[PDB]
C-alpha cells in the first residue's frame, strides 16, 4: 500500500513506537497483542475486528509471542487512517437513546454497564468500571449525550 505520511511524521510514529517497546534488548519490536494500544495512542479509534483484520487473522498464541518491527507496522497504520466511518455524534447518541425507556434524556446505570459488556464487541468488567469513573446521578441515572461528549474528548 502507498504511504501518504510526511518524513517528519514517520519519525513522530517511530518515537511513539519506542515507548511501547518493553524489551530490555531494545530491538524496537512489539507483540501482535499490544499492536492496538499503539494505534489508539496515535489518535485513532479502531474496533477489535479491524485490529485482528490488519494482522492477517492472528492466533491467541501469536498475539502474546509473535513480535513485529516498525517497517511492517507502518502499512497497517496507513489502512486504519484511511477509515472515515467512525460514527457521528448523532449516531452515538441515537444508539444510547434506544435504552432510554422513559424518553427523558437519561439511561439507568446498571443497564449501560450490561449493554457495553454484552452487546457488540464486549468490554471487560474492569473496562466497564474504569469507563464509569465520573459516575452517575443520586439515583443513577446517567446523562447520555453528555456521556458522548465525555468519551469523544477523553
Amino acid at each position: 500500500i502507498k504511504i501518504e505520511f510526511t518524513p517528519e511524521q514517520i519519525e513522530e510514529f517511530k518515537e511513539a513506537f519506542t515507548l511501547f517497546d518493553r524489551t530490555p534488548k531494545c530491538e524496537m519490536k512489539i507483540t501482535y497483542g499490544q499492536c492496538g494500544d499503539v494505534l489508539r495512542a496515535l489518535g485513532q479509534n479502531p474496533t477489535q475486528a479491524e485490529v485482528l483484520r490488519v494482522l492477517g487473522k492472528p492466533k491467541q498464541e501469536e498475539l502474546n509471542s509473535k513480535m513485529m518491527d516498525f517497517d511492517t507496522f507502518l502499512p497497517m497504520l496507513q489502512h486504519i487512517s484511511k477509515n472515515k466511518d467512525t460514527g457521528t455524534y448523532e449516531d452515538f447518541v441515537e444508539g444510547l437513546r434506544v435504552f432510554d425507556k422513559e424518553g427523558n434524556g437519561t439511561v439507568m446505570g446498571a443497564e449501560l454497564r450490561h449493554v457495553l459488556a454484552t452487546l457488540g464487541e464486549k468490554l471487560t468488567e474492569d473496562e466497564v468500571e474504569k469507563l464509569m469513573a465520573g459516575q452517575e446521578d443520586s439515583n443513577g441515572c446517567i446523562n447520555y449525550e453528555a456521556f458522548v461528549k465525555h468519551i469523544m474528548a477523553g
Binding site: 479502531p46 444508539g95 444510547l96 468519551i151 477523553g154
Partner: protein, 783 residues
C-alpha cells in the same frame, strides 16, 4: 397481578400475564436472521435455528433437536420475543401461517383462550371451565373500548351494545366454527351479557301475554327448549346444535330490552330416524325415556328402554356429560316459562312418542305379490291413537296411496321409506312451530328501535363425504365471508381516503363472487337442481350430465371430482374461498323435492289432535334449495343493515383434551374460517401504518442526518427525507396526513436494518470507549 388487571379479580391471569411474567418468559436468545419456521409433515410447521445456506437450500436445527434441509422459499421468519402471546395479531411484524398458529397456541398453553386478529375475536376451546365469565368480569368490561382491556367475548358484547347506543344503528355478532369449537358456549355468554346489562323497558302486561317472569328470563329459557329438539350427541360434540340460528335481540330507546326473534336453518331431519354408530338422536327422546316424569311414558304408551325403538337406538343411547333426567326437568320448565300450555306441551310429547312407534311398525310382502301389507298392528295402533288418526286408514294409506283416482302399489322398501319421510316432516314442522311459538312470547310493549343479531352457524368445513346439505352450508359461508371481505374493504377504503393514499383495488368481496354466481345465478348449480326437479323422468345421472354440459368448460370454479382411494364416491368439485370440495350428487333431486305420501298427509290434515292438523293445514306437494335461497337472502338483508362483529371458534383437538393442540387441525380451521383470508385481502393494501412522530422516534438511528437534531421540525418532511435516503424500494410505502403507509414485509426490513445499525453503533461506542481507556493509561505513562 399488575394494577391495570386488579379490576378483573380471579380472571386476571386467564386474560393477561403480568409485566414481570412477560419479560421473564420473553428473555431468550433471538437472532432475527437464524430463528425461523420450517415446514413439518406431522406438525405443519416447527421453530428452527439456521446453520448453513448452501445452494438454494437452508440447513437448520429444529426444536426437538432434529437437523433438516429445506428450500429457501419454504423458510419463514419468526416474530421477535417482544411479540410473544400478543393480544391483537394484526400488530405482528410477520403475519404468515406459523406466526398466527404459534401466537394462538402459545396463549392457549397459558390458558388465555381469547385473541384478536384485526377485526376477528378468535377463541380456542379450553375443555375446562376458567373463572373468566363471572359478574366481577362483567363489571370490569363495562364501557371499555377493545384496546382498553385484554381480549374477551364480553368486549364484543359490550362494544356492540355501546356502538348501538352511540352510532344509533343495528349490530350483528357472527359466531362460526366447527362442531365442538364453542359456538353455543359463546352465543349463550353474549345473550346472558345483554340480559345482565340491558335497560329495563315497559313491563306492563299485554292482552295475549304468556310466560313466566321477565323478557330477560324468557330469552334465556329459549335455549333449553330449542336444545331438546334441535341438539344431539355427535362424535365431535355431546351437545351439538343440528341447526343454524340467528337471534335478533330488539332494543327500544336507550338500550331498553324490547323483544327477541329466532330464525332457524337447515335442521338435520335425517337424525330423527337415523344415527351413525357413535351418535344419538335428538336429546328429547332420551329425556322422555329417563322416566323422570313417569306420567309421560303412560301418555305416549312407551317403555323406558331406548332399544325398544328402532329410530333412536341405532348408535348410542347414553352420554357421559348428559344427565337426561335433569335435562327433561329443564326442558319442561323452559316451555312453562315460555308460556306453552299443557295442551301444547303434551301434544309435542305425544307427537314425539308417535315418531318412536312409527319406526316400530313392521311390514311384509303379500304372498305371490310385490305389494306390502302390515306385519302386526300394535305399534300402528299406538301411533294413530297419539296422532289422532284411524289405525286402518293410516296403514291403508301407507300401503295403497291414491295418486293423480289411481291407487298406487307399494313394496316393503317403499312403505319403510315413506313412513320415515313422514316422521321427519312431522318433527321438522313441530320444531318450526315451537320457534314460531317462542317468538310470540318474546314480546313487550316497548317499541322496537335497534337490534343486535347473534348468528350461530357451522363454519366452512371440508368432510370426506360432501353431499347437498354441505353445499347449502358451504354456500351460506361463501356469502358470509364475502360480507366480511366487503366490510374490511370499506374500512380500508375509508382509511386510505381519510389519510389521502391513492390506492386502487376491486372490493375484496368480488373475490368470492364467481363461486356464489356458480351456485345461485340462473342456470347455476341450484337453478339446474330446481330445473331437474320439475321433470319426473330425471335421475342423478341426468342432473350430473346437465351440470357438466353447463359448467365443465366456461366455469373455472367447477371441475371434475379429484377422487382418490380412501375418500368415497364424488361427482364434481367446487373451488370455494377456503379450498376445493368434492361433491357427491346421489339423492339431491329427492332431497330437494322432499316427496311425502300425500294420502297419509290428508289424514294428518283431518286429525283429532289440533297440533297435527295445524302443522299440515298449509301443506303443498309438487323446494329445499328455494327455501334456503330465500332464508339466506333474508339473513343477508338483516346483516347488511348492521355494524358486524366476528367471532371465530376453534376446536384444539379431536379428543376433548384440555390444553392440547393438534397443529394440522388448528391450521385447517384457520384456512377455512376467514382469519387467514382477512390477512390475504389486507396484504393487498398497506397492512402496516405508523404515525410520523412514532416513526421518527424509532427509525432516526437509520440516518440521523436526514432528521437533524432540533427543538422544532415538521415530522412528515423528516420521515420523507429518511426513507428516501435509504437503499430501499421507494414504491413499497406511501405518505399520509398523520401516518406512513407500508406494504407487507417492508417493516421486517426496516427492523433488520435497525438492529444491524444499533449493533454497529454500539461497536463504535465501545471502540471510542477503548480509546479513552488507552489514553488514560498513556496520560499516566507520560506523567
Amino acid at each position: 397481578v399488575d394494577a391495570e388487571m386488579a379490576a378483573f379479580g380471579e380472571a386476571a391471569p386467564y386474560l393477561r400475564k403480568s409485566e414481570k411474567e412477560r419479560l421473564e418468559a420473553q428473555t431468550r436468545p433471538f437472532d432475527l436472521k437464524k430463528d425461523v419456521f420450517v415446514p413439518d409433515d406431522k406438525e405443519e410447521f416447527v421453530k428452527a435455528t439456521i446453520l448453513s445456506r448452501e445452494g438454494g437450500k437452508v440447513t437448520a436445527e429444529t426444536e426437538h433437536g432434529k437437523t433438516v434441509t429445506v428450500k429457501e422459499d419454504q423458510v419463514l421468519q419468526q416474530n421477535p420475543p417482544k411479540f410473544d402471546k400478543i393480544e391483537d395479531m394484526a400488530m405482528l411484524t410477520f403475519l404468515h401461517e406459523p406466526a398466527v398458529l404459534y401466537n394462538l397456541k402459545e396463549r392457549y398453553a397459558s390458558w388465555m383462550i381469547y385473541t384478536y386478529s384485526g377485526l376477528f375475536c378468535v377463541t380456542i376451546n379450553p375443555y375446562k371451565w376458567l373463572p373468566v365469565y363471572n359478574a366481577e368480569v362483567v363489571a370490569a368490561y363495562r364501557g371499555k373500548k377493545r384496546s382498553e382491556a385484554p381480549p374477551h367475548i364480553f368486549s364484543i358484547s359490550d362494544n356492540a351494545y355501546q356502538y348501538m347506543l352511540t352510532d344509533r344503528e343495528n349490530q350483528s355478532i357472527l359466531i362460526t366454527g366447527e362442531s365442538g369449537a364453542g359456538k353455543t358456549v359463546n352465543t349463550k355468554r353474549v345473550i346472558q351479557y345483554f340480559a345482565v346489562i340491558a335497560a329495563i323497558g315497559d313491563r306492563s302486561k299485554k292482552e295475549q301475554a304468556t310466560g313466566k317472569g321477565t323478557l330477560e328470563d324468557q330469552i334465556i329459557q329459549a335455549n333449553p327448549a330449542l336444545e331438546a329438539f334441535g341438539n344431539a350427541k355427535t362424535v365431535r360434540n355431546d351437545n351439538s346444535s343440528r341447526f343454524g340460528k340467528f337471534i335478533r335481540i330488539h332494543f327500544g330507546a336507550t338500550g331498553k330490552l324490547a323483544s327477541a326473534d329466532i330464525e332457524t336453518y337447515l335442521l338435520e331431519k335425517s337424525r330423527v330416524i337415523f344415527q351413525l354408530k357413535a351418535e344419538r338422536d335428538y336429546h328429547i327422546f332420551y329425556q322422555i325415556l329417563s322416566n323422570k316424569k313417569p306420567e309421560l311414558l303412560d301418555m305416549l304408551l312407551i317403555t323406558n328402554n331406548p332399544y325398544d325403538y328402532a329410530f333412536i337406538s341405532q348408535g348410542e343411547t347414553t352420554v357421559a356429560s348428559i344427565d337426561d333426567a335433569e335435562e327433561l326437568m329443564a326442558t319442561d320448565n323452559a316451555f312453562d316459562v315460555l308460556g306453552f300450555t299443557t295442551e301444547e306441551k303434551n301434544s309435542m310429547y305425544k307427537l314425539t312418542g308417535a315418531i318412536m312407534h312409527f319406526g316400530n311398525m313392521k311390514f311384509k310382502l303379500k304372498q305371490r305379490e310385490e305389494q306390502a301389507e302390515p306385519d302386526g298392528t300394535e305399534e300402528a295402533d299406538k301411533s294413530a291413537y297419539l296422532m289422532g288418526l284411524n289405525s286402518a286408514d293410516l296403514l291403508k294409506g301407507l300401503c295403497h296411496p291414491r295418486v293423480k283416482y289411481v291407487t298406487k302399489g307399494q313394496n316393503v322398501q317403499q312403505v319403510v321409506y315413506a313412513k320415515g319421510a313422514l316422521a321427519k316432516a312431522v318433527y321438522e314442522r313441530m320444531f318450526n312451530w315451537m320457534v314460531t311459538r317462542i317468538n310470540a312470547t318474546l314480546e313487550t310493549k316497548q317499541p322496537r328501535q335497534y337490534f343486535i343479531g347473534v348468528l350461530d352457524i357451522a363454519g366452512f368445513e371440508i368432510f370426506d363425504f360432501n353431499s347437498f346439505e354441505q353445499l347449502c352450508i358451504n354456500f351460506t359461508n361463501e356469502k358470509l365471508q364475502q360480507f366480511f371481505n366487503h366490510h374490511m374493504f370499506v374500512l380500508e377504503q375509508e382509511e386510505y381516503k381519510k389519510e389521502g393514499i391513492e390506492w386502487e383495488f376491486i372490493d375484496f368481496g368480488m373475490d368470492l363472487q364467481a363461486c356464489i354466481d356458480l351456485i345461485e345465478k340462473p342456470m347455476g348449480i341450484m337453478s339446474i337442481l330446481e330445473e331437474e326437479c320439475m321433470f319426473p323422468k330425471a335421475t342423478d345421472m341426468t342432473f350430473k350430465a346437465k351440470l357438466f354440459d353447463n359448467h365443465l368448460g366456461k366455469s373455472s370454479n367447477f371441475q371434475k371430482p379429484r377422487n382418490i382411494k380412501g375418500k368415497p364416491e364424488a361427482h364434481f368439485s367446487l373451488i370455494h374461498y377456503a379450498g376445493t370440495v368434492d361433491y357427491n350428487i346421489i339423492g339431491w333431486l329427492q332431497k330437494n323435492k322432499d316427496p311425502l305420501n300425500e294420502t297419509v298427509v290428508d289424514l294428518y290434515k283431518k286429525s283429532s289432535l289440533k297440533m297435527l292438523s295445524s302443522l299440515f293445514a298449509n301443506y303443498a306437494g309438487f323446494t329445499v334449495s328455494a327455501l334456503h335461497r330465500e332464508n339466506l337472502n333474508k339473513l343477508m338483508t338483516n346483516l347488511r343493515s348492521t355494524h358486524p362483529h366476528f367471532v371465530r371458534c376453534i376446536i384444539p383437538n379431536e379428543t376433548k383434551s384440555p390444553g392440547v393442540i393438534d397443529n394440522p387441525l388448528v391450521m385447517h380451521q384457520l384456512r377455512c374460517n376467514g382469519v387467514l383470508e382477512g390477512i390475504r385481502i389486507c396484504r393487498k393494501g398497506f397492512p402496516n401504518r405508523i404515525l410520523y412522530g412514532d416513526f421518527r422516534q424509532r427509525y432516526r438511528i437509520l440516518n440521523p442526518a436526514a432528521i437533524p437534531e432540533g427543538q422544532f421540525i415538521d415530522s412528515r418532511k423528516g420521515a420523507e427525507k429518511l426513507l428516501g435516503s435509504l437503499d430501499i424500494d421507494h414504491n413499497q410505502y406511501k405518505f399520509g396526513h398523520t401516518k406512513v403507509f407500508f406494504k407487507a414485509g417492508l417493516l421486517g426490513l426496516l427492523e433488520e436494518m435497525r438492529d444491524e445499525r444499533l449493533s454497529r453503533i454500539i461497536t463504535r461506542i465501545q471502540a471510542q470507549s477503548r480509546g479513552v481507556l488507552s489514553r488514560m493509561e498513556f496520560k499516566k505513562l507520560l506523567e
